[PDB]
Amino acid sequence: YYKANVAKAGLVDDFEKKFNALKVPIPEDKYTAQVDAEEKEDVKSCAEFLTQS
Amino acid sequence: SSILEERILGADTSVDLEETGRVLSIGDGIARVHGLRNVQAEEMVEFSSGLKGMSLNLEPDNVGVVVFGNDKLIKEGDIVKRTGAIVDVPVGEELLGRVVDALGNAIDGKGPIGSKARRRVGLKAPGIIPRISVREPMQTGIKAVDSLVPIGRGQRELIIGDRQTGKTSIAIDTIINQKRFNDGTDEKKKLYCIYVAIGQKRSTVAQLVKRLTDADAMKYTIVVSATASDAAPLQYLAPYSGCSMGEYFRDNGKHALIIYDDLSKQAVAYRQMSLLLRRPPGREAYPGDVFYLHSRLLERAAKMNDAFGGGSLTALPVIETQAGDVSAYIPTNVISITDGQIFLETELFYKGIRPAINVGLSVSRVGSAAQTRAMKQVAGTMKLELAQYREVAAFALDAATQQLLSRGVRLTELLKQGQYSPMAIEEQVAVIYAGVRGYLDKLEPSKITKFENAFLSHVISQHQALLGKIRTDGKISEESDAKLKEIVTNFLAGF
Amino acid sequence: DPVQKLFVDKIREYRTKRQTSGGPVDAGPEYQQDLDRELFKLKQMYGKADMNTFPNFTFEDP
Ligand SMILES: Nc1ncnc2c1ncn2[C@@H]1O[C@H](COP(=O)(O)OP(=O)(O)OP(=O)(O)O)[C@@H](O)[C@H]1O
Ligand SMILES: [Mg+2]
C-alpha cells in the first residue's frame, strides 16, 4: 500500500528488500563472570562460614 | 490531474427559481435584508459571498439576519437567497474523527463530511415521559471524580474553576479513557465523545486534536471548534451544533458525551450579539435571556428510557470564574441548571494537588446511583474518612484526632493523578482499597505517590486475573477482598 | 451533457493543459523559489540525510 502511495515505487521496493536483508546484530553476554562470583562466594561462604559453624 | 477534471464533472450547475432579498445595511454583525417575503423565522439564508445567516427578526418591512461569518464580506445591495430550512447541521457517524466548525464545514482538510442526515440546532429537549433516571456509570478514569463525585450517563455535570486549574485536562482525560469501552464487544458501553471548543485559541484546539490523535482517541471524538477569532454568532451557535450532533446518537439508541468548553465564553458572545442588537442589558450587561440560552442547551442532555431507544447524552459544561467567585451571575445561572458540579480550586492546584477537585464543595446529585458496586464499597468509606479529616484540618492531639489527620493526608496524596493517565475502574478500586482499609498509615505521606505507581505496576503485571474478576463481576466479593488484601500486604512487605 | 457550454469549455481547456504538459507548463521563477523554501523547511524538519541512502546505526553495548 505504501508503495502504491509513492511515485518512486521501485525505490520503495528496493528499500523494503534491503530492510528485509538487514538483521540487527544480536548483542552478546559478557557476564557469566557473575556465575564465577556465584561459584567463588559459594566456596567461600560454604567452606569458611558453614564449616566453622 | 485528470482527477481534477472529473472533479469538474458531476458538479451541480442546474439553476433554480429561488426567492431573494437585497441587503439594506450591514454593520455590527446584523444585516438588514429587504424582501424575503416568504422567509421563515430562524431560517438559514445565504449571502452572495457564500456566507450564511440566520433570519432572526421578521419585522414588517425588513428581516434582521445575523451573519455567521465576518460581516466585512457583505456589502449593501448584496443578494440574499433563502435556503428554505431552519438552521440545520449535518449529523451521523460520518463526522467521528472530524474537526468540523460550528456549521459542519470541515476545517480539517481530509475531504468533506459525507453526512446524509441533518438536524435542527433549535430543537426541543425531551419531555418528562421519555426521560428515565440515570442508571449507568460514565467512567471518567480520574480517581477523585470516579470515587467521590461520580457521574452517570444522562447526567449533566459542571466543571467550574479559575484560569488554568485543569478543566480542559479533566475533559480530555474523560474523552481518552473511553478508548477501552469503544473497543470491546458490547455496543451498550461504547461512548461517542464530542468536544465543543468555544472562544478558545485555535492553536490550543490544534494541539488538543493532535493529542487526541496520539492516544487513538479520534476514532469516536468530534471536535466542533468556534475559536476566539470566529465571529460572535458562531461562538453562540457552536454549542447547539454540538448538542445536535450528540442528540443524533441519543435518539438512535447510542450513548454520547458532549463537553462545552467554555460556556462562559458563549454567554459573552451572546452578550455581544444582544448589545449590538440594542437589547436592554441587565445584570453585568448580560441580557435577561442569558439563562434560557443555557437552560435550553443543557436540558437536552437527557437519558431516554427503553421505550425511546435507550440512548443518552451526558454533558460536561465548563465554566470559568474570575477570582473563583462561585456566586457570580453566569456561574449561578448554570449551577441551577445542572445535576452536579466539580469545583477546581486554584490554591489546591498551586499546591501541586492535581487534579484540584475541591471535594468539600463538589457534589453529584445522582451520585451513588449509577456507580459500580465495587467502587461504592471502597469509596463510601473514603468519603466518610475525608469528611472527618476536613472537619479537623484547621489546626496542625489525641489518638483518634491524629489518626484522622494521618489517614486524610494519605488519602489526599492517593487521589492525585497525572495528565493523560486514566485508570480502569478496577485499578482505582485496588488503589483506594489499599488506601482506606489502612495499609498505608505507616508509609511516609511524601512517598504515597511513588508507592501508588509501583503498586500498579505489580498489580497490572501479575494479578490481572483478580482485576478481570472485579471488572466482570462488578463487585468485591469476600474471596476477592481476601486476595486483594494479601496482594497489598505482600507488596507493601517489600519496602 | 455537452450542451452546457461551461463544462465543455473547462474540458477542452484542461485537455490543452494535458497536452502542453509534455513538460510542466508555466512554472515561473516564483515557482522555483517556493519549491526551494518549502523543500528547505521539509528537509530541515527531517534532516540532512541523502535523498535515498539506506543508513545504519552501527550499534554498541553498555
Ligand atoms: N492532573 C494534572 N496533573 C498535573 N498537571 C496538570 C493536571 N491537570 C492540568 N495540569 C496542568 O495545568 C496546566 C493547564 O491546565 P488546563 O489547560 O487543563 O487548565 P484549563 O482550565 O483548561 O486552562 P484554560 O481553561 O485557561 O485553558 C497544564 O500545563 C497542565 O500541565
Ligand atoms: Mg482549557
XYZ file of C-alpha atoms and ligand atoms in Angstrom:
642
model
C 0.000 0.000 0.000
C 2.785 2.408 0.885
C 4.458 1.799 -2.466
C 1.130 2.454 -4.149
C 1.263 5.763 -2.270
C 4.782 6.506 -3.586
C 5.820 7.774 -7.006
C 9.338 6.285 -6.945
C 7.837 2.887 -6.193
C 10.871 0.914 -7.345
C 12.912 2.709 -4.713
C 10.301 1.652 -2.158
C 10.694 -1.990 -3.150
C 14.473 -1.596 -3.060
C 14.320 -0.203 0.476
C 11.882 -2.866 1.651
C 14.093 -5.622 0.288
C 17.266 -4.217 1.812
C 15.469 -3.744 5.131
C 14.455 -7.393 4.974
C 18.117 -8.167 4.332
C 19.460 -6.220 7.299
C 19.077 -8.003 10.626
C 20.016 -6.167 13.804
C 23.239 -7.689 15.190
C 22.283 -9.861 18.173
C 24.213 -8.314 21.115
C 26.085 -10.667 23.392
C 26.725 -11.626 27.013
C 29.984 -10.935 28.836
C 28.832 -11.597 32.386
C 28.993 -15.252 33.168
C 31.653 -13.739 35.421
C 28.705 -13.265 37.738
C 28.356 -17.055 37.594
C 32.022 -17.039 38.534
C 31.051 -14.940 41.544
C 28.296 -17.457 42.266
C 30.855 -20.228 42.499
C 33.559 -18.255 44.306
C 31.327 -16.886 47.030
C 29.788 -20.360 47.145
C 33.055 -21.983 48.136
C 33.898 -19.053 50.407
C 30.697 -18.931 52.427
C 30.154 -22.695 52.372
C 33.632 -23.705 53.459
C 34.526 -20.982 55.923
C 31.236 -19.872 57.433
C 29.298 -23.121 57.102
C 32.042 -25.401 58.492
C 33.288 -23.061 61.175
C 29.604 -23.206 62.056
C -4.553 15.761 -12.585
C -7.383 14.350 -14.682
C -8.922 13.535 -11.313
C -9.445 17.293 -11.102
C -11.223 17.226 -14.452
C -13.536 14.552 -13.085
C -13.953 16.849 -10.088
C -15.251 19.393 -12.609
C -17.830 16.934 -13.889
C -20.705 15.993 -11.632
C -20.814 19.447 -10.049
C -24.407 20.629 -9.700
C -24.903 23.556 -12.080
C -28.662 23.335 -12.640
C -30.240 26.706 -11.910
C -33.358 27.012 -9.771
C -36.143 29.505 -9.179
C -35.416 30.892 -5.729
C -36.719 33.733 -3.601
C -34.300 36.549 -2.921
C -33.789 39.745 -0.977
C -31.450 42.715 -1.096
C -29.279 43.799 1.821
C -30.075 47.278 3.136
C -27.459 47.894 5.828
C -24.701 45.701 7.259
C -22.876 46.742 10.390
C -22.440 45.461 13.944
C -22.833 41.931 12.579
C -26.579 42.207 11.886
C -27.632 42.714 8.281
C -30.959 44.264 7.362
C -32.346 42.423 4.350
C -35.197 43.803 2.266
C -37.620 41.383 0.687
C -37.642 37.693 1.561
C -41.408 37.759 1.909
C -41.799 34.004 2.443
C -38.830 33.583 4.787
C -39.428 31.552 7.926
C -38.168 32.668 11.306
C -34.847 31.121 12.328
C -34.359 30.160 8.687
C -30.885 29.952 7.160
C -30.384 32.452 4.360
C -27.237 32.556 2.225
C -25.495 35.710 1.068
C -23.964 36.167 -2.362
C -20.462 35.766 -0.905
C -21.013 32.193 0.277
C -21.679 33.273 3.862
C -24.691 32.073 5.819
C -27.012 33.912 8.155
C -29.881 33.116 10.464
C -33.130 35.011 9.967
C -33.572 36.368 13.491
C -36.150 39.184 13.287
C -39.096 39.220 10.916
C -40.002 42.866 11.030
C -42.805 44.084 8.774
C -40.555 45.898 6.306
C -37.255 44.028 6.618
C -35.555 40.962 8.051
C -32.774 41.087 10.583
C -30.226 38.448 9.592
C -27.362 37.543 11.911
C -24.337 36.750 9.768
C -22.375 33.589 10.570
C -19.070 34.998 9.348
C -17.141 38.217 9.024
C -19.578 40.976 8.096
C -16.796 42.592 6.046
C -17.670 40.195 3.210
C -21.180 41.670 2.928
C -21.883 44.907 1.091
C -25.103 46.879 0.826
C -27.075 45.776 -2.199
C -25.860 42.192 -1.968
C -28.273 39.353 -2.713
C -29.593 37.032 -0.004
C -31.124 33.710 -1.046
C -33.324 31.839 1.398
C -32.394 28.162 1.601
C -35.790 27.176 2.993
C -34.738 25.218 6.071
C -34.434 26.165 9.734
C -30.781 26.337 10.751
C -29.532 22.807 10.120
C -26.338 20.882 10.795
C -25.110 17.562 9.446
C -25.179 14.593 11.794
C -24.128 10.977 11.627
C -21.174 8.708 12.269
C -19.524 10.263 9.219
C -18.368 13.093 11.489
C -16.486 10.975 14.017
C -12.820 11.880 13.930
C -13.510 15.116 12.045
C -12.912 18.686 13.188
C -15.963 20.460 11.822
C -16.617 24.126 12.540
C -19.830 25.481 14.038
C -21.804 24.695 10.857
C -20.400 21.311 9.874
C -17.937 22.672 7.315
C -14.859 20.527 7.859
C -11.939 22.762 8.791
C -9.796 19.641 8.798
C -8.795 19.163 5.197
C -9.319 15.429 4.854
C -12.033 15.892 2.251
C -15.615 16.879 3.025
C -18.102 15.477 5.516
C -20.100 12.706 3.900
C -23.160 13.202 6.071
C -26.556 12.048 4.835
C -28.791 13.418 7.617
C -29.423 16.879 9.045
C -30.789 18.063 12.381
C -32.079 21.403 13.606
C -29.870 23.250 16.062
C -33.020 24.763 17.550
C -34.733 21.553 18.565
C -36.602 20.984 21.817
C -35.482 18.972 24.810
C -37.178 15.652 25.602
C -40.209 15.958 27.820
C -40.882 14.249 31.131
C -42.046 10.797 29.971
C -39.134 9.857 27.683
C -36.547 10.503 30.371
C -35.631 7.825 32.895
C -33.481 8.018 35.997
C -29.726 7.890 35.498
C -28.572 4.288 35.883
C -25.350 3.595 34.020
C -21.930 4.937 35.053
C -19.814 7.285 32.975
C -16.228 6.325 33.762
C -14.025 9.413 33.853
C -10.857 7.470 34.595
C -9.967 10.060 37.247
C -9.754 8.685 40.762
C -11.202 11.722 42.529
C -14.068 12.184 40.076
C -14.903 8.484 39.788
C -14.812 7.796 43.530
C -16.067 10.883 45.359
C -18.161 12.822 42.836
C -19.183 10.138 40.323
C -21.034 10.839 37.095
C -23.790 8.935 35.328
C -24.968 8.548 31.759
C -27.608 11.182 31.161
C -26.334 13.376 33.958
C -25.047 16.830 33.111
C -22.196 17.624 35.465
C -20.497 21.006 35.576
C -16.768 21.699 35.820
C -16.203 25.104 37.369
C -12.925 26.757 38.258
C -10.470 29.521 37.540
C -7.908 30.056 34.789
C -5.542 27.109 34.415
C -6.809 24.732 37.057
C -7.204 21.678 34.847
C -10.717 21.801 33.455
C -9.729 21.011 29.888
C -7.427 18.311 31.259
C -10.299 16.587 33.055
C -12.347 16.827 29.880
C -9.569 15.335 27.763
C -8.891 12.531 30.226
C -12.582 11.661 30.205
C -12.507 11.570 26.409
C -9.365 9.432 26.285
C -10.479 6.943 28.911
C -13.429 5.865 26.776
C -10.998 4.124 24.427
C -11.254 0.763 26.180
C -15.046 0.698 26.035
C -15.033 1.787 22.391
C -13.026 -1.330 21.513
C -14.922 -4.005 23.448
C -17.714 -6.179 22.100
C -20.943 -4.706 23.501
C -22.309 -1.572 21.874
C -24.048 -0.769 25.168
C -20.849 0.556 26.779
C -19.470 2.464 23.792
C -19.412 6.230 24.353
C -19.025 8.595 21.395
C -17.423 11.694 22.846
C -17.871 15.185 21.405
C -15.869 18.288 22.282
C -17.096 21.817 21.596
C -14.369 24.454 21.789
C -15.916 27.902 22.213
C -13.837 31.050 22.139
C -10.568 29.162 22.559
C -7.213 29.814 20.960
C -7.017 27.958 17.665
C -3.552 26.643 18.472
C -4.927 25.101 21.660
C -7.540 23.153 19.719
C -4.929 22.098 17.169
C -2.695 20.668 19.881
C -5.709 19.068 21.556
C -6.621 17.310 18.319
C -3.008 16.193 17.955
C -3.076 14.764 21.483
C -6.379 13.002 20.886
C -4.902 11.508 17.730
C -1.796 10.309 19.564
C -3.985 8.456 22.064
C -6.009 6.945 19.211
C -8.962 8.873 20.637
C -10.204 10.435 17.402
C -11.922 7.270 16.208
C -15.016 8.463 18.092
C -14.461 12.125 19.008
C -15.932 15.074 17.121
C -14.354 18.487 17.699
C -16.619 21.446 16.941
C -14.311 24.444 17.076
C -15.619 28.015 17.145
C -12.342 29.527 18.254
C -11.523 33.004 19.531
C -11.257 34.699 16.148
C -14.576 33.387 14.829
C -17.428 35.867 14.808
C -19.676 36.004 17.846
C -22.725 34.461 16.097
C -20.574 31.366 15.603
C -19.425 31.020 19.198
C -23.071 31.426 20.168
C -24.126 28.690 17.746
C -21.365 26.127 18.252
C -22.818 24.566 21.423
C -26.118 23.985 19.667
C -24.407 22.352 16.703
C -22.525 20.039 19.029
C -25.620 19.262 21.064
C -27.388 18.291 17.845
C -24.552 16.020 16.757
C -24.997 14.394 20.166
C -28.775 14.272 20.091
C -28.449 12.208 16.930
C -26.776 9.400 18.859
C -29.067 9.874 21.849
C -32.106 9.416 19.613
C -30.609 6.453 17.734
C -30.068 4.285 20.796
C -26.395 5.122 21.343
C -24.541 6.968 24.087
C -22.837 10.323 23.642
C -20.802 12.732 25.742
C -20.593 16.433 24.908
C -18.122 18.821 26.525
C -18.819 22.521 26.085
C -15.581 24.351 26.793
C -16.306 27.028 27.883
C -19.912 28.052 28.371
C -18.713 31.290 29.937
C -17.393 32.302 26.501
C -20.671 31.578 24.761
C -22.579 33.862 27.100
C -20.058 36.575 26.261
C -20.690 36.082 22.548
C -24.412 36.240 23.242
C -23.952 39.418 25.251
C -22.112 40.910 22.291
C -24.881 39.865 19.925
C -27.594 41.300 22.155
C -25.890 44.602 22.921
C -25.289 45.051 19.201
C -28.992 44.367 18.656
C -29.606 47.175 21.208
C -31.424 44.854 23.611
C -31.698 46.203 27.169
C -28.724 44.982 29.210
C -29.320 43.556 32.642
C -27.063 42.347 35.439
C -23.411 42.654 34.376
C -24.698 43.829 30.982
C -25.974 40.325 30.222
C -29.417 40.196 28.609
C -32.219 38.724 30.653
C -32.263 35.927 28.066
C -28.830 34.663 29.133
C -30.491 31.955 31.220
C -32.813 30.496 28.598
C -29.698 30.379 26.413
C -28.041 27.811 28.676
C -31.159 26.142 30.036
C -32.409 25.227 26.593
C -28.953 23.967 25.632
C -28.320 21.844 28.721
C -31.843 20.464 29.025
C -31.079 18.221 26.047
C -28.527 16.171 27.982
C -31.233 13.620 28.738
C -31.383 9.845 29.237
C -34.164 8.314 27.174
C -35.987 5.293 28.553
C -36.007 1.917 26.848
C -39.254 2.727 25.041
C -37.366 5.560 23.283
C -34.238 3.728 22.167
C -32.407 3.868 25.465
C -29.658 6.216 24.318
C -28.205 9.000 26.402
C -26.265 12.252 26.138
C -24.026 13.258 29.022
C -22.941 16.896 29.148
C -19.921 18.450 30.868
C -20.200 22.236 30.610
C -17.015 24.045 31.595
C -17.476 27.400 33.311
C -14.642 29.761 34.198
C -14.946 32.005 37.244
C -12.959 35.183 37.790
C -11.170 35.167 41.148
C -13.073 31.993 41.962
C -16.379 33.779 42.596
C -18.858 30.910 42.551
C -21.672 33.399 43.235
C -21.287 35.475 40.073
C -24.132 35.688 37.584
C -23.325 33.033 34.972
C -21.879 30.523 37.473
C -25.136 30.574 39.423
C -27.205 30.543 36.252
C -25.538 27.260 35.387
C -25.297 25.837 38.912
C -29.104 25.885 38.893
C -29.359 24.123 35.523
C -27.024 21.165 36.072
C -27.090 17.978 38.122
C -23.810 18.431 39.964
C -20.524 20.260 39.962
C -16.772 19.795 40.244
C -15.089 22.784 41.839
C -11.447 23.099 40.845
C -9.727 25.239 43.442
C -6.861 27.420 42.279
C -4.964 27.076 45.568
C -5.175 23.298 45.755
C -3.851 23.381 42.205
C -0.985 25.671 43.206
C -0.080 23.186 45.950
C 0.586 20.515 43.344
C -2.586 18.640 44.306
C -3.772 17.869 40.788
C -6.477 17.382 39.711
C -7.610 20.087 42.112
C -11.174 18.935 42.802
C -12.425 20.664 45.937
C -14.209 17.643 47.351
C -15.801 19.778 50.051
C -17.975 21.642 47.551
C -18.121 19.194 44.636
C -21.286 17.103 44.509
C -23.198 14.890 42.086
C -26.962 14.831 42.544
C -27.291 11.339 41.135
C -24.165 10.286 42.986
C -24.310 6.817 44.474
C -26.785 5.774 41.814
C -25.014 4.659 38.655
C -21.792 3.761 40.439
C -20.045 0.419 40.187
C -20.825 -1.538 43.333
C -17.147 -2.270 43.974
C -16.270 1.410 43.811
C -19.207 2.104 46.112
C -17.879 -0.309 48.733
C -14.378 1.107 48.579
C -15.264 4.793 48.261
C -18.085 5.286 50.760
C -15.510 4.738 53.482
C -13.181 7.206 51.784
C -15.943 9.796 51.604
C -16.613 9.466 55.341
C -12.908 9.497 56.204
C -12.236 12.562 54.072
C -15.225 14.255 55.681
C -13.775 13.620 59.131
C -10.320 14.769 58.036
C -11.708 18.020 56.655
C -13.688 18.596 59.845
C -10.446 18.843 61.842
C -7.724 20.078 59.474
C -7.980 23.690 60.722
C -5.062 23.260 63.152
C -1.761 21.369 62.998
C -3.772 15.887 69.812
C -5.276 12.567 70.891
C -5.027 9.187 69.161
C -8.253 9.459 67.163
C -7.577 13.033 66.029
C -4.054 12.281 64.849
C -5.358 9.112 63.220
C -7.901 11.161 61.273
C -5.236 13.652 60.209
C -2.852 10.923 59.054
C -5.470 8.910 57.175
C -6.797 12.029 55.489
C -3.348 13.131 54.372
C -2.645 9.670 52.997
C -5.911 9.698 51.050
C -5.231 13.167 49.655
C -1.832 12.002 48.450
C -3.534 8.942 46.992
C -6.073 10.890 44.943
C -3.508 12.887 42.973
C -3.094 11.856 39.354
C -1.120 12.586 36.225
C -2.205 14.043 32.911
C -3.448 11.739 30.159
C -3.264 8.820 32.596
C -6.789 7.468 33.051
C -7.166 4.349 35.179
C -9.591 1.485 34.709
C -12.235 1.154 37.392
C -10.632 -1.937 38.916
C -7.294 -0.141 39.267
C -8.941 2.735 41.134
C -10.747 0.214 43.323
C -7.481 -1.522 44.167
C -5.602 1.683 44.976
C -8.338 3.208 47.111
C -8.743 -0.152 48.845
C -5.073 -0.211 49.777
C -5.514 3.362 50.971
C -8.663 3.277 53.094
C -8.537 -0.102 54.854
C -5.308 1.151 56.394
C -2.371 -0.500 54.612
C -0.567 2.823 54.266
C -0.693 4.546 57.667
C 2.994 3.833 58.342
C 4.442 4.862 54.979
C 5.507 8.490 54.821
C 2.969 10.716 53.032
C 5.634 12.032 50.664
C 6.163 8.502 49.320
C 2.470 7.688 48.869
C 2.613 8.704 45.214
C 5.653 6.585 44.399
C 4.124 3.595 46.168
C 0.987 4.003 44.072
C 2.956 3.855 40.832
C 4.957 0.787 41.810
C 1.864 -0.925 43.172
C 0.016 -0.501 39.889
C 2.969 -1.952 38.005
C 2.811 -5.067 40.154
C -0.967 -5.440 40.100
C -1.302 -4.971 36.351
C 1.558 -7.420 35.801
C 0.825 -10.473 37.948
C -2.783 -10.438 39.187
C -4.682 -9.475 36.037
C -6.991 -12.379 36.889
C -8.250 -10.650 40.037
C -8.829 -7.372 38.207
C -10.726 -9.204 35.487
C -12.806 -10.848 38.198
C -13.618 -7.436 39.673
C -14.450 -5.961 36.265
C -16.698 -8.813 35.146
C -18.446 -9.202 38.496
C -18.690 -5.508 39.269
C -18.328 -6.104 42.994
C -15.662 -7.085 45.515
C -16.689 -10.470 46.872
C -15.240 -11.748 50.134
C -12.748 -14.048 48.411
C -11.779 -11.216 46.067
C -11.379 -8.968 49.095
C -9.086 -11.509 50.760
C -6.968 -11.958 47.638
C -6.627 -8.197 47.274
C -5.746 -7.898 50.962
C -2.953 -10.440 50.721
C -1.683 -8.871 47.492
C -1.460 -5.452 49.131
C 0.201 -6.821 52.259
C 2.752 -8.799 50.259
C 3.642 -5.881 48.008
C 3.952 -3.468 50.922
C 6.222 -6.001 52.622
C 8.878 -5.195 50.037
C 9.527 -1.741 51.470
C -24.251 16.680 -21.087
C -22.149 18.596 -23.640
C -24.820 21.274 -24.158
C -23.722 23.244 -21.095
C -21.017 25.401 -22.631
C -19.010 25.838 -19.438
C -18.478 22.116 -18.885
C -17.141 21.559 -22.396
C -15.068 24.737 -22.104
C -13.333 23.545 -18.952
C -12.957 20.101 -20.509
C -11.190 21.392 -23.608
C -9.014 23.833 -21.686
C -7.845 21.063 -19.373
C -7.221 18.847 -22.400
C -4.955 21.556 -23.775
C -3.285 21.653 -20.370
C -2.674 17.916 -20.561
C -1.052 18.051 -23.985
C 1.041 21.087 -23.066
C 2.094 19.096 -20.006
C 4.602 17.208 -22.163
C 6.581 19.248 -19.725
C 5.091 21.146 -16.781
C 3.750 24.427 -18.125
C 4.193 27.932 -16.698
C 6.433 27.303 -13.717
C 7.728 30.851 -13.310
C 10.706 31.581 -11.054
C 8.374 32.212 -8.107
C 7.592 28.513 -8.507
C 11.267 27.646 -8.080
C 11.777 29.864 -5.030
C 8.657 28.460 -3.374
C 9.952 24.961 -4.064
C 13.286 25.969 -2.581
C 11.856 27.288 0.670
C 9.317 24.518 1.211
C 11.806 21.751 0.474
C 14.255 23.519 2.780
C 11.847 23.530 5.707
C 10.854 19.935 4.919
C 14.412 18.599 4.934
C 15.346 20.740 7.933
C 12.456 19.171 9.834
C 13.585 15.744 8.623
C 17.364 16.027 8.456
C 20.369 16.314 6.171
C 20.379 12.688 5.010
C 20.535 11.838 1.329
C 17.522 11.510 -0.932
C 17.617 7.709 -0.795
C 20.524 6.498 1.372
C 19.735 3.342 3.355
C 21.742 4.033 6.523
C 22.737 2.089 9.628
C 23.355 2.949 13.272
C 26.416 0.732 13.943
C 25.143 -0.429 17.309
C 27.124 -0.776 20.537
C 26.788 -2.250 24.040
C 26.801 -0.828 27.601
N -3.894 16.235 36.627
C -2.877 17.077 36.367
N -1.632 16.834 36.803
C -0.613 17.670 36.551
N -0.750 18.805 35.852
C -1.951 19.168 35.360
C -3.103 18.305 35.599
N -4.152 18.889 35.011
C -3.711 20.035 34.444
N -2.401 20.196 34.656
C -1.574 21.319 34.176
O -2.282 22.551 34.170
C -1.906 23.315 33.027
C -3.138 23.967 32.448
O -4.205 23.063 32.658
P -5.505 23.123 31.747
O -5.137 23.808 30.473
O -6.099 21.753 31.665
O -6.398 24.104 32.636
P -7.566 24.943 31.946
O -8.531 25.415 32.986
O -8.035 24.181 30.752
O -6.808 26.231 31.404
P -7.659 27.157 30.438
O -9.042 26.817 30.893
O -7.210 28.546 30.778
O -7.327 26.654 29.062
C -1.292 22.360 32.025
O 0.001 22.815 31.628
C -1.202 21.039 32.740
O 0.114 20.502 32.652
Mg -8.517 24.852 28.744
